CSV table of C-alpha atoms in Angstrom, one decimal:
chain,number,residue,atom,x,y,z
S,19,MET,CA,24.0,12.2,-2.3
S,20,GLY,CA,23.2,14.5,0.7
S,21,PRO,CA,21.5,14.6,4.1
S,22,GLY,CA,18.0,14.7,2.4
S,23,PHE,CA,18.6,11.4,0.5
S,24,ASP,CA,20.2,10.0,3.8
S,25,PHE,CA,16.9,10.6,5.7
S,26,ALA,CA,14.8,9.3,2.8
S,27,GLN,CA,16.9,6.2,2.5
S,28,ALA,CA,16.6,5.5,6.3
S,29,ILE,CA,12.8,5.6,6.0
S,30,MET,CA,12.7,3.5,2.8
S,31,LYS,CA,15.0,0.8,4.2
S,32,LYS,CA,13.0,0.1,7.4
S,33,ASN,CA,9.5,1.6,7.0
S,34,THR,CA,8.2,0.5,3.5
S,35,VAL,CA,6.7,-2.6,2.0
S,36,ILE,CA,5.4,-3.3,-1.5
S,37,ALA,CA,1.5,-3.4,-1.3
S,38,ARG,CA,-0.5,-4.9,-4.1
S,39,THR,CA,-4.4,-4.6,-4.5
S,40,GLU,CA,-6.6,-5.3,-7.5
S,41,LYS,CA,-5.9,-1.6,-8.5
S,42,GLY,CA,-2.0,-2.0,-8.7
S,43,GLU,CA,1.3,-2.1,-6.9
S,44,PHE,CA,2.0,0.8,-4.3
S,45,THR,CA,4.7,2.0,-2.1
S,46,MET,CA,3.2,1.6,1.4
S,47,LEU,CA,4.7,3.5,4.5
S,48,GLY,CA,4.6,1.5,7.8
S,49,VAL,CA,4.2,4.0,10.7
S,50,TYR,CA,4.2,1.9,13.9
S,51,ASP,CA,3.2,-1.6,15.2
S,52,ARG,CA,1.2,-3.2,12.2
S,53,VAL,CA,-0.3,0.1,11.0
S,54,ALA,CA,0.6,1.5,7.5
S,55,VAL,CA,-0.9,4.0,5.1
S,56,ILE,CA,-1.7,3.8,1.3
S,57,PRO,CA,-3.7,6.1,-1.1
S,58,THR,CA,-7.5,5.5,-0.8
S,59,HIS,CA,-7.7,4.9,-4.6
S,60,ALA,CA,-5.7,1.6,-3.9
S,61,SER,CA,-9.2,0.3,-2.8
S,62,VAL,CA,-7.8,-1.9,0.1
S,63,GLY,CA,-10.1,-5.0,0.7
S,64,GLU,CA,-10.2,-7.8,3.3
S,65,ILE,CA,-6.9,-9.3,1.7
S,66,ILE,CA,-3.8,-7.4,0.4
S,67,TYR,CA,-0.4,-8.7,-0.9
S,68,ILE,CA,2.6,-7.3,1.2
S,69,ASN,CA,6.0,-8.1,-0.5
S,70,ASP,CA,4.0,-10.7,-2.6
S,71,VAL,CA,2.6,-12.5,0.5
S,72,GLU,CA,-1.2,-12.9,1.1
S,73,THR,CA,-2.0,-10.8,4.2
S,74,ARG,CA,-5.4,-10.4,6.1
S,75,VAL,CA,-6.4,-6.7,6.6
S,76,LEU,CA,-7.5,-6.4,10.3
S,77,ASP,CA,-8.9,-2.8,9.7
S,78,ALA,CA,-8.9,-0.2,7.0
S,79,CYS,CA,-10.2,3.4,7.5
S,80,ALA,CA,-10.4,5.9,4.6
S,81,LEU,CA,-9.8,9.2,6.3
S,82,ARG,CA,-12.0,12.3,5.7
S,83,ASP,CA,-11.8,15.7,7.4
S,84,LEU,CA,-14.5,17.1,9.7
S,85,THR,CA,-16.2,18.7,6.7
S,86,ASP,CA,-16.6,15.0,5.4
S,87,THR,CA,-14.1,15.8,2.5
S,88,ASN,CA,-11.7,13.0,1.2
S,89,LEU,CA,-8.1,13.2,2.5
S,90,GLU,CA,-7.0,10.3,0.1
S,91,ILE,CA,-5.2,8.5,3.1
S,92,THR,CA,-6.3,4.9,4.1
S,93,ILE,CA,-4.9,3.7,7.4
S,94,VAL,CA,-4.4,-0.1,7.3
S,95,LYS,CA,-3.8,-2.5,10.1
S,96,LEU,CA,-2.0,-5.6,8.7
S,97,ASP,CA,-2.2,-9.2,10.1
S,98,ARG,CA,1.7,-9.3,9.9
S,99,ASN,CA,4.1,-11.3,12.3
S,100,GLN,CA,6.4,-8.3,12.6
S,101,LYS,CA,6.1,-4.6,13.7
S,102,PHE,CA,7.4,-1.5,11.9
S,103,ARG,CA,9.9,0.8,13.6
S,104,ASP,CA,7.8,3.5,15.3
S,105,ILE,CA,8.4,6.8,13.2
S,106,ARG,CA,5.4,8.8,14.6
S,107,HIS,CA,8.0,11.3,16.1
S,108,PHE,CA,9.0,12.3,12.5
S,109,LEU,CA,5.3,13.3,11.6
S,110,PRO,CA,4.4,17.0,11.5
S,111,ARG,CA,1.8,18.2,14.0
S,112,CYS,CA,0.3,21.0,11.7
S,113,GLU,CA,-0.3,21.7,8.0
S,114,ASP,CA,2.8,23.5,6.6
S,115,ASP,CA,5.0,24.4,3.6
S,116,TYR,CA,8.5,22.8,3.2
S,117,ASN,CA,11.8,23.3,1.5
S,118,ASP,CA,14.0,20.7,-0.3
S,119,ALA,CA,11.7,17.6,-0.2
S,120,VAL,CA,12.5,14.1,-1.6
S,121,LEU,CA,9.9,11.7,-3.0
S,122,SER,CA,11.0,8.0,-2.6
S,123,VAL,CA,9.4,5.0,-4.4
S,124,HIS,CA,10.0,1.3,-4.1
S,125,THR,CA,8.0,-1.1,-6.4
S,126,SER,CA,8.8,-3.8,-9.0
S,127,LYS,CA,8.5,-1.0,-11.7
S,128,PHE,CA,10.7,1.5,-9.7
S,129,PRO,CA,13.1,-0.1,-7.2
S,130,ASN,CA,15.3,2.3,-5.0
S,131,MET,CA,13.9,5.5,-6.7
S,132,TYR,CA,14.6,8.9,-5.1
S,133,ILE,CA,13.5,12.2,-6.6
S,134,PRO,CA,14.5,15.6,-5.3
S,135,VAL,CA,11.2,17.5,-5.8
S,136,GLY,CA,12.3,20.8,-4.2
S,137,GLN,CA,9.8,23.3,-2.7
S,138,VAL,CA,6.5,21.8,-1.3
S,139,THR,CA,3.4,24.1,-1.1
S,140,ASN,CA,0.4,23.7,1.2
S,141,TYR,CA,-1.9,23.7,-1.8
S,142,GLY,CA,-5.1,22.7,0.2
S,143,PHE,CA,-8.0,21.9,-2.1
S,144,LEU,CA,-7.6,19.7,-5.2
S,145,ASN,CA,-10.2,18.0,-7.5
S,146,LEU,CA,-8.3,14.7,-7.6
S,147,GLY,CA,-9.6,12.3,-10.3
S,148,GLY,CA,-12.9,14.3,-10.0
S,149,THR,CA,-13.0,13.8,-6.1
S,150,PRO,CA,-12.8,17.0,-4.0
S,151,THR,CA,-9.7,16.4,-1.7
S,152,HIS,CA,-8.2,18.5,1.2
S,153,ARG,CA,-4.7,18.8,2.8
S,154,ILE,CA,-2.9,18.4,-0.6
S,155,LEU,CA,0.9,19.2,-0.8
S,156,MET,CA,2.2,20.2,-4.3
S,157,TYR,CA,5.7,20.0,-5.8
S,158,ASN,CA,6.8,21.1,-9.3
S,159,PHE,CA,8.0,17.7,-10.6
S,160,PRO,CA,6.4,15.8,-13.5
S,161,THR,CA,5.6,12.6,-11.5
S,162,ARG,CA,4.2,9.5,-13.4
S,163,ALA,CA,2.0,6.4,-12.9
S,164,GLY,CA,3.8,4.0,-10.5
S,165,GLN,CA,4.7,6.7,-8.0
S,166,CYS,CA,1.5,6.6,-5.9
S,167,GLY,CA,2.2,5.9,-2.2
S,168,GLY,CA,5.7,7.3,-2.6
S,169,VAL,CA,7.0,8.8,0.6
S,170,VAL,CA,7.6,12.6,0.8
S,171,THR,CA,10.3,13.6,3.3
S,172,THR,CA,12.5,16.4,4.4
S,173,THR,CA,15.5,16.1,6.7
S,174,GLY,CA,13.9,15.1,10.0
S,175,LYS,CA,10.2,14.8,8.7
S,176,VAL,CA,7.9,12.4,6.9
S,177,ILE,CA,5.3,14.9,5.5
S,178,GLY,CA,3.1,13.0,3.0
S,179,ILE,CA,2.4,10.2,0.5
S,180,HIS,CA,2.2,10.8,-3.3
S,181,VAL,CA,-1.5,10.5,-4.6
S,182,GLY,CA,-1.4,12.0,-8.1
S,183,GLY,CA,-0.2,14.5,-10.7
S,184,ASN,CA,-1.2,16.5,-13.8
S,185,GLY,CA,2.0,15.9,-15.9
S,186,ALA,CA,3.8,19.2,-14.6
S,187,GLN,CA,3.0,19.0,-10.8
S,188,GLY,CA,2.8,16.2,-8.3
S,189,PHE,CA,0.4,16.0,-5.3
S,190,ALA,CA,0.8,14.3,-1.9
S,191,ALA,CA,-1.7,13.8,0.9
S,192,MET,CA,-0.4,15.3,4.2
S,193,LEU,CA,0.6,12.9,7.1
S,194,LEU,CA,-0.2,14.5,10.5
S,195,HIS,CA,0.8,13.1,14.0
S,196,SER,CA,-2.9,13.2,15.1
S,197,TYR,CA,-3.9,10.5,12.5
S,198,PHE,CA,-1.8,7.9,14.4
S,199,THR,CA,-2.7,8.5,18.2
S,200,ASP,CA,-3.8,5.2,20.0
């Protein structure tokens, strides 16, 4: 409807796949080459389904900060025959607050879903499903089951992936450029 949705749509159309694990179906953001991200609570194993195709996981790393606190991001390298468009230049370098964000989801349950969530706070610490978690972004939208892995964007930036909610607020794990240096 506007330049926010334009950016979100551009990311969804080229940089997302449907990931299925034994814990559910997730929006999965491809970042570069065969590297993607998913919430750690997806419990990625040796095999994952990508757009309903059996795919070997070449590597999976559940990220933690240097205090050994959960970040709720898992970086996955996929045994896929095709690379993602490189979107690492759209990743923020530092922790920050944002205006006018969009949360975009693409699953069997929620195809082509875009939500204008508005103001995004650098919330920091969250007890997420009983797990202490850092670098949490917060938006005042009542997000629901099926939205985990959803991409949070502003015009020009891919800033996080949706990892939970409490019925009134939604929470995303930050994406930082420094996670994806090679």
